Amino acid sequence: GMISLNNRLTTVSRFLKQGTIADIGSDHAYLPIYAIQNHLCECGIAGEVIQGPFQAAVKNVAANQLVDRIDVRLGDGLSVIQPEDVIDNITICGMGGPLIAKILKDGQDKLSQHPRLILQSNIQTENLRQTLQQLNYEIIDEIIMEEKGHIYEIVVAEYSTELIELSSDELKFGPKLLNNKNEYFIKKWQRELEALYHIKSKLNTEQHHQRLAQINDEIAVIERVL
């Protein structure tokens, strides 16, 4: 029947443009299946990095009668993208910011048709914003939201004919999310402060001068924005 997604991925789906979705490291092709069942996209590519998710995606596409509309591919990151593909959206979800960043940078040659990027980061989204900036991408929307008590960020970006430089605060906190600072922004960064002060409970100041200087600088950045 109709697939139901979690709220994190449902929220991602609301940023899809019409056409093709390429879901990278897909969670068993459910986001592409949902997108087609709901008429958000026409066609899909589901990239799966290892055999288990690959085999599951193949079975799920077949079970939903979408074998002619979603192409399930085995490969890491953007390695699955083929030269003849027409891709309107690349989605990369359920990963840390640093991994999404690495996928985009390592795969940058696959971005020539300038698709919309919809990235859903679990942690440390700074790295992905730094990479987007390097790739002539511009953040056009951001969401911060909570599901099952965990806070997730969604970053929506499109290609710009000039590189868009972000400040240190915009990279760390988000150029859109800074404009709003919703209850989930405050909760996320309160939690991150608690984690940084907790690290200070574990590191002797005589033995960790360099590392503690970095932690204290980061605390001061967050305390200024809250």
Residue numbers in the entry: 0 to 225
Provide the authors' own sentences about this structure as they appear in the paper.
The electron density data for the SaTrmK apoenzyme showed clearly defined density near the active site that could not be fitted with any of the small molecules involved in purification or crystallization of the enzyme, suggesting it was carried through with SaTrmK from protein expression. Intriguingly, citrate could be fitted perfectly into the electron density, making polar contacts with the side chains of His27, Tyr29, and Asn59. It is possible the negatively charged groups of citrate are mimicking the phosphate group(s) of tRNA. Therefore, the significance of this observation, if any, is still elusive. In the absence of tRNA, SaTrmK contributes no background luminescence, as expected since the enzyme is not purified bound to SAH. This is evidenced by the crystal structure of the apoenzyme and no SAH detected by LC-MS after denaturation of SaTrmK which would have released any bound SAH. Superposition of the three structures revealed negligible effect of cofactor binding on Cα root-mean-square deviations (RMSDs), whose values were 0.15, 0.18, and 0.08 Å between SaTrmK and SaTrmK:SAM, SaTrmK and SaTrmK:SAH, and SaTrmK:SAM and SaTrmK:SAH, respectively. A superposition of the active sites of SaTrmK, SaTrmK:SAM, and SaTrmK:SAH shows there is local motion of some residues in order to accommodate the cofactor.
TrmK catalyzes the transfer of a methyl group from SAM to tRNA, producing m1A22-tRNA and SAH. TrmK is essential for Staphylococcus aureus survival during infection but has no homolog in mammals, making it a promising target for antibiotic development. To shed light on the structural basis for cofactor binding and help inform future structure-based inhibitor design, crystals of SaTrmK apoenzyme, and the binary complexes SaTrmK:SAM and SaTrmK:SAH were obtained, and data were collected to a resolution of 1.3, 1.4, and 1.5 Å, respectively.
